Design an enzyme around this catalytic site. Sequence first.
Site, short mmCIF file in Angstrom:
data_model
loop_
_atom_site.label_atom_id
_atom_site.label_comp_id
_atom_site.label_asym_id
_atom_site.label_seq_id
_atom_site.Cartn_x
_atom_site.Cartn_y
_atom_site.Cartn_z
CG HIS A 41 -0.91 0.30 2.80
ND1 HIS A 41 -0.14 -0.43 3.65
CD2 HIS A 41 0.24 1.29 3.46
CE1 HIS A 41 0.28 -0.15 4.84
NE2 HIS A 41 0.68 1.44 3.76
N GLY A 138 3.06 6.17 10.54
CA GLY A 138 4.32 5.70 10.58
C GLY A 138 5.72 4.06 10.48
CB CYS A 140 3.11 0.70 7.96
SG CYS A 140 1.33 1.74 7.97
#
Lengths: 301, 301
Positions: A41, A138, A140
Site C-alpha cells: 500500500h 509511520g 507500517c
Amino acid sequence: SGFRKMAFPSGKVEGCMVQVTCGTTTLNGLWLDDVVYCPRHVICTNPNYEDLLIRKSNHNFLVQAGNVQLRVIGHSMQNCVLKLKVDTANPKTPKYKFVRIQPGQTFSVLACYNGSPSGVYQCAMRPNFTIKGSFLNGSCGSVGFNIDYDCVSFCYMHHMELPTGVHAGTDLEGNFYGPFVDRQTAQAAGTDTTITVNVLAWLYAAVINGDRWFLNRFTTTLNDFNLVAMKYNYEPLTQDHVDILGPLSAQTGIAVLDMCASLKELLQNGMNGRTILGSALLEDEFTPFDVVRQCSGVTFQ
Amino acid sequence: SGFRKMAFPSGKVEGCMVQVTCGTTTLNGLWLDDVVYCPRHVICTNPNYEDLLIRKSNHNFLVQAGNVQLRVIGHSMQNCVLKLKVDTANPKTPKYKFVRIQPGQTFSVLACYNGSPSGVYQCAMRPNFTIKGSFLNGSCGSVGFNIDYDCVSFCYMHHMELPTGVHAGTDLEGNFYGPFVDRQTAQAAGTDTTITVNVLAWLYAAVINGDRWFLNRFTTTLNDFNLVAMKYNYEPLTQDHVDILGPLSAQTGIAVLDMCASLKELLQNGMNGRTILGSALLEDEFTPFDVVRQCSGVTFQ
C-alpha cells in the site's frame, strides 16, 4: 529468578531496516541481500494494485539506508508485499528464514519509524489473528521475528490498525494473518479467546519462581477441564498441549492435569486480591518454549 | 495505539558484550574503546578485593569477543567494577555515557550469558534500589541502559540476586545502587513503595488509548491526595512531579489533580473486575517520558 516479558535482542534486525518513500508515502522496508520488502500500500493512489504497480517506475521508489541512497533496479509484487530489487546487497544480512507462525505463538516486534528502530517488545499472535501491538503512524513495515541461535525467522510485517486498536499484518510472503485486507473496509477483529496452554505455561513459570498459593490437592480429566474452559472463553486444551507441557511438569513435579485443576479453580473463584508473577490477571502471551528459555538459560547469536 | 512494555533497540549494546573468564568464574563484560568493564567478584578466591587483585596477572583474564581472543594489557579496580585494558579498541563502540539513574526511572536490560545476548526487557529502579529483573546463573555483568538519539547511556551493571528474587547491581563506575555489597551477607531488600508519578503517567497512557472508565468528576488538593497515598504505600507526589505530568495533562485535557482524584478512588475502591491497558493492577514502571515517547513517535539511531 524473576519473570519478564522478554524480547529477542534486536541488533540483527536493526541492521536490515530502511526507509521506503514513493509519492507522499513513507514507511519501513526490510533489506535482505539485494531485496527490500515493504507493504504494497506504499503504491501511489478502493485499489487494484496490479493496475497501480504497472503504472510505476523504479525511480519512483526512494530507498534510504541510513545516509546512503539505495538504487532500485527492479520491482515486483508478492501478494500484499512489494519486493524492490536494489543494486546493493545488504552487508549486514543475517542468516534468515521467512516462517509463518500459529495463533498462540509469540514473537518480538521491532517498532520502526522512517526506517529508524524505535523500540522492541514481545507479542503473541491472538487466536483471532490480530496482535495487541504498540504502533503509531509511520510504523507500517515494521517486522516481527524470532531468533534461533544465529538465524532470524521473520514472521510478521505490520500493515494496519483495526478499529479496536489492535493490529493486523502479513507474513513475509505477503499473506495476511486472518481475514484482513489492505484496503479500506469496515473490517473488524473477530471475537478472541484466551490461549489456555500459554496460561498453563505461565503458571509453571510462577511455580518455578516460588509463587505457589494457587496450587491445590485436586485433579481433573482433560474433558472436565475443557468443559470449564469453553465456559470462560478459553481455547480447548489438546493432548499435544499436555505433551508440550511435559518438561515443565517434570521440572516442578506438578502433573499437567493437576495444574489444570488449579486453573479451573482460578477461573471459578478469581484471584482474591493475590497476584501471580506480579500480575492480577491470568497471562497468556508466554508459550511453553518461552518459559523454559527464560528459566534454563538459552541464549542466541 | 496500543501500549506495551517497550525496550530500546539493543544492537548498539550487543556489539559491546564480551565474555570474561578468570579462574573458574565466567561472566559478561562490557567492551568500550580499549577497556572491558565487569564485576570485580570475578576476582579469584569474606573478601578483601585490593588484596586479591594485587595477586592477579593480566594473563589471568581470558576475554572472548565472539571468536576472537582479547589480549589484556592492564587491569585496575574502580569501586565494585574491574577495568581490563585490552590491546584492541572495539570498532563497534557507540557514542556513550555512564549515568546513574534515580529510583522511579526506567531502563532496558540486555540479559547475557557467556558474553552472548539472550533477551531484552524494560525495568524500573525500585524506590528501595532493587530491580525486579529476570536473571539466571551467569548473567552477572549484563548491563542496563537507555538510548537518546545515537548515544547509549549505560546506567546499570548486574551483580547479584537477593533472597526475595529481586536484583542488585552498580552503576558503571562500580557504585552500588542501594545498601548492597558484593560479598555474602544476610542483606535483604528494604520495604518498597509504589512510584506514584509513574502510575499517573500510565493512567494518562490509558486515557490516550481510550480507557476512561476510571475518570471522575472529583478533584483533590496535593496534600489530601498525599494523605491517601502514604496510606497505600505510595511515594509522595511532589509539585515537580505535577509539572512533569503537565504535557500529558495538556494532551488529554485532564488536570493532574483530577487524575489524582481518580487514582485516589482506584486505591479506595479497587478496580471492580475491570482492567486498564490490559492490566488488573496499577502499573508503576512507565515514566512520563516513556508514555510520551510511546504516544508521540520518538525514535533513536
